[PDB]
Amino acid sequence: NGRDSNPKYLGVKKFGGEVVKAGNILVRQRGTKFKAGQGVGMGRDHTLFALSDGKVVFINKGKGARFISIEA
């Protein structure tokens, strides 16, 4: 063994209560650990970036049912 692979510094890049420019990246994820609410659009590797400038808010009933909206 003695093998390993680079860190992928994934996360909630922008936490609810953070104003965001358009195109800011807010969550990094392997998949849909977050499912993108209103105003946000999710990319190829399933990072989801805000489309509209404003505050970031978490809709989060959880269990795969967590969504990131942006409010203007």
CB 41 within 8 A of CB 28: no
Site string for Mg ion, 1-40 (x = CB under 5 A): x---------------------------------------
Assess 38 for contact with RNA (CB under 7 A).
Answer: no
Q: DSSP letter at 64?
A: S
Q: DSSP letter at 9?
A: -
CB 56 within 8 A of CB 26: yes
Binding region for RNA (CB under 7 A) = 1-19, 21-25, 28-33, 35, 41, 43-47, 49, 51, 58-61, 63-66
